[PDB]
Amino acid sequence: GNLDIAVYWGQNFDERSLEATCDSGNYAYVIIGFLNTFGGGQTPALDISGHSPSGLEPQIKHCQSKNVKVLLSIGGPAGPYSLDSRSDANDLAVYLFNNFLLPPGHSENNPFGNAVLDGIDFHIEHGGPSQYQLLANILSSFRLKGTEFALTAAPQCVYPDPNLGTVINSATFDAIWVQFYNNPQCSYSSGNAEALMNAWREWSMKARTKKVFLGFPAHPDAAGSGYMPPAKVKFHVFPAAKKSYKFGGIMLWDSYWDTVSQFSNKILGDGV
């Protein structure tokens, strides 16, 4: 009926703006990616495909005024990020908290100005579990201190996830969006959704989170494999998945490609 869609934004310089993405009306969550440099003596850096970080301040406020939640994603598909020591975890938890999850005051100084984000998304694609449990414990502590925000995760579709499975088992994530793409063991391929349905059954039964979202590519070009057309998604997936207490909705990789394909418009029946 009413379907929640989460979308990644920030992956191309020429993409539809953050504010226009929120104005579409298609999305419950917009995830800005990525804080992709941290750890191992590096200072943190954003790679958001050349968008001005300060120029996002008023766009995030606008999104929030339309009841879209805006999250920052850490890690990403690529980047020199690692979290091997306990000191890295602490340092990163503190940086994220001051600079993104709390209002200013002052000397910080916030990459997105005075915006305060609605949560942090763990999109950890390499480095094993490392100290990511400790990072989640600390952030989760801050959540219990009155500063309210979401913690989400984007594991790959093989259960348990090699990077995050350990952290997911702690039940700390409010939601997770499993990437049902780029891996033929657990995503749609060759007119065959059996591998997908099986992975989905496993994730919806075992993952310790209240909401599980299905992550699909928005266009055949958006991923190496796993593209599944909207009509097939509605027909094949929805009836079974809506039978799960944990069914959260779908996640789309990504806003740039969804602008081209109109995948979310087809899934929703032309929603504005």
Automatic annotation (TrEMBL):
Ranges in coiled-coil conformation: none
Taxonomy, superkingdom: Eukaryota
Keywords: Alpha-amylase inhibitor, Carbohydrate metabolism, Chitin degradation, Disulfide bond, Glycosidase, Hydrolase, Polysaccharide degradation, Xylan degradation
GO cellular component: extracellular region
Reaction it catalyzes: Random endo-hydrolysis of N-acetyl-beta-D-glucosaminide (1->4)-beta-linkages in chitin and chitodextrins
Domain GH18 span(s) in chain numbering: 3-272
GO molecular function terms listed in the Swiss-Prot or TrEMBL record: alpha-amylase inhibitor activity; endochitinase activity
GO biological process: one example: xylan catabolic process
Name under which the protein is recorded: chitinase
Species this protein is from: Scadoxus multiflorus
Designated gene of the protein: XAIP
